[PDB]
């Protein structure tokens, strides 16, 4: 109850109008600041205790940013568009040693989004579901987070079937990209910890903080 897709869409429209790895890390750090503002625009999020707000963002920031640049890259030929306005071509990513993860983003996320023409409302809702992850460890009231999530996909399904009546399986199709997002999110984090370990690849303060423990 009280989870209008209009507010979710607004949050998306409000936050967004040579080693490629380094460029990706700078873009991620950059978007981390924008991510917090996006979250504050998601209904009832800011109403949760500060401690749980931190846990939720800590637990889903990687998937949240990935979903975002992936959808942004729908208009891209063979690459990804970073928030900084730079483009990472497949060859560039390949030549940097990150071709494997790059190919997964394109095939499992970008390509699928483009083919089904995922819109900004749907993207917003999927990220809202990810943000409200009831499995996040440390939550003082997991039931409360579970409630918000249920309200999001409840509004999302309503959005679909209504906008896209001719596609009864659209709602499920949207939800079925979450497993790929989870796996891809995990691999990207592994690469980030390796970059931090090796020493090379400058990592900014906010991104570094997210890599911090726990």
């Amino acid at each position: 109850e009280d989870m209008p897709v209009e507010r979710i869409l607004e949050a998306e429209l409000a936050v967004e109008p040579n080693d490629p790895v380094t460029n990706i890390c700078q873009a991620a750090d950059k978007q981390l600041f924008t991510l917090v503002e996006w979250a504050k625009r998601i209904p009832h999020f800011s109403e949760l205790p500060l401690d749980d707000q931190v846990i939720l963002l800590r637990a889903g920031w990687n998937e949240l940013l990935i979903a975002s640049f992936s959808h942004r890259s729908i208009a891209v030929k063979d690459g990804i568009l970073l928030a900084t306005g730079l483009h990472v071509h497949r060859n560039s990513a390949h030549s940097a040693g990150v071709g494997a993860i790059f190919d997964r983003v394109l095939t499992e996320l970008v390509s699928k989004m483009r083919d089904m023409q995922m819109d900004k409302t749907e993207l917003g809702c999927l990220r809202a579901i990810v943000l409200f992850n009831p499995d996040s460890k440390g939550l003082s009231n997991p039931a409360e987070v579970e409630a918000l999530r249920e309200k999001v996909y409840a509004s999302l399904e309503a959005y679909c079937k209504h906008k896209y009546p001719e596609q009864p399986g659209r709602f499920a199709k949207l939800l079925l990209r979450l497993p790929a997002l989870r796996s891809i999110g995990l691999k990207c984090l592994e690469h980030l910890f390796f970059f931090k370990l090796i020493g090379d690849t400058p990592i900014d303060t906010f991104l570094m903080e997210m890599l911090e423990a726990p």
């Binding site: 917090v36 800011s46 903080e209 911090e212």
Partner: peptide, 11 residues
Amino acid sequence: KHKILHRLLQD
């Protein structure tokens, strides 16, 4: 901990 994140959320 989580210096940056807390400050941003509070603002």
